[PDB]
Every structure is written in structure tokens, then in C-alpha cells.
């Protein structure tokens, strides 16, 4: 949709991806703005492009710049939302269509194997996922399993055609030691939803009006009674879940 035309952003993404290890899967491969540079990292690479005609053209481009038939990126003409991710370690890299960002993020967050994701998306979504100015409900809902980092802002002028809003480069890393067991994910995410939408002014007031916490719990866990849900850390949410489960 909005193809990346700024080579400096390509350099920045390749720099981040170069510090990771293992196979790479790229979403929204387009004409190969990131695929060709990632292929030069000499690691196994799969490039996913939903437009079959464009994917056929990309397969010719990757093959031409590859060492040769004996040594080789796999180009897949598929919708990433239907693409089965391997259960083995890999890194995901993508330039996401802005209207599909939340759906692709949910697909990845529920998916297996990937240890790092490097994703280009809307600046406002990337800021919220990385908890800039505080966490949002969706960020806190996934924090026991993943960490999020805002690598850089990317102007709408870095794409052709230009999108209506600016973009952000977001990194996501799968925690090797989850803070909450994956089997308790639904119950954990429901608790987070309940606190972010509960009535009351400050954590002390919100936790009193919920159907689940000792009077001494907040301050014992380093939480100011007037604090907002967006100010809690991942460890504090995991401790609240352990307390109310």
C-alpha cells in the first residue's frame, strides 16, 4: 500500500535486523525495498507479498541478485493473515498496511516461533504499543509475553505514495521467561481490560470497585494510590494477576 522509498529507513531496519539471528520472514514485501537488502545478510529469508503479479516480479528480482540457483530467498504469494508461521525460531520484518495493523499485530502476538519483530506502522499505533506517555490496555494485555520498543519515527514523506499520517518503527521481542503462563492469557487479558475500563479516580479507587485486593497491596507493590492504569509496569500487572487469580 505505502511502499518504503527512503533508503535511510531501509538502512535503519537492516541495522536492527542485522543484530538478530536466524531465519527471516518479511510481510508486505512489495517490490523488494527491504527484501533485496535483507537477502544480503546471507540468512534464510521468506518474503510474503499478497499481489501475485508483484510477487512473481519480486521472485525474479531476488533470484537475479542471489548468488544463484544453488544458493535462496523464497517468495510467497499469500495473505500474511492466512500464512502459517513456523514453530521454530525466526525474526519477522514488515511494512504493514495501516488499515490492517491491529489485525496483523494480533495474528503475530498469538503466533509461534518468532523471537523479534521489526515493524513499520502508523506513528500513533507504534507510540501506544511502545507505551510512550504510558501504556494502553492492549500493551499491558501482552506485556507478560512480549516487550515493545519504539526505534524511530518515520515521516509520511519516507513513503511513496505518502500516507495521511506519519509512521513509527516498532520492535517486539518475545520474553524467554514469560511473566504469566500462556495458559492464563485470557484471564490475564480480562483483568487488564477490567482495570483500564473500571470506574474510579486512581488505582486505589479502581481496585476497590472491582469483583476481585488487600488495602496494603498497592503501596506494598510500589504503586501510588493516585496512579493511573497507564503508569503500571509489566511486573506490577503480573503481580496484580497473581493476587487476583
Residue numbers in the entry: 13 to 83, 85 to 225, 227 to 259
Question: What text does the study give?
Answer:
Using SAM as a cofactor, Erms transfer a methyl group to adenosine at position 2058 (A2058) in the ∼3000 nucleotide-long 23S ribosomal RNA. This subtle posttranscriptional modification blocks the antibiotic-binding site in the ribosomal peptide exit tunnel.
Erm38 comprises 386 amino acids (NCBI WP_063844518; Uniport Q79N53), with analysis using the Database of Disordered Protein Predictions predicting that the N-terminal 12 residues and C-terminal 124 residues are disordered regions. We therefore expressed a truncated version of Erm38 spanning residues 13 to 261. This truncated Erm38, referred to as Erm38 throughout, has a molecular mass of 30 kDa and a size similar to most Erms from Gram-positive bacteria. The electrostatic potential of Erm38 includes a highly positively charged region that comprises residues R119, R140, R141, R142, and K166 located at the protein surface. As these solvent-exposed basic residues are likely to be involved in binding the RNA substrate, we produced an alanine mutant for each site and compared the enzymatic activities of the mutant and WT enzymes. The E61K, R119A, R140A, and R141A mutations resulted in >90% reduction in methylation activity, whereas the R142A mutation resulted in 75% loss of enzymatic activity.
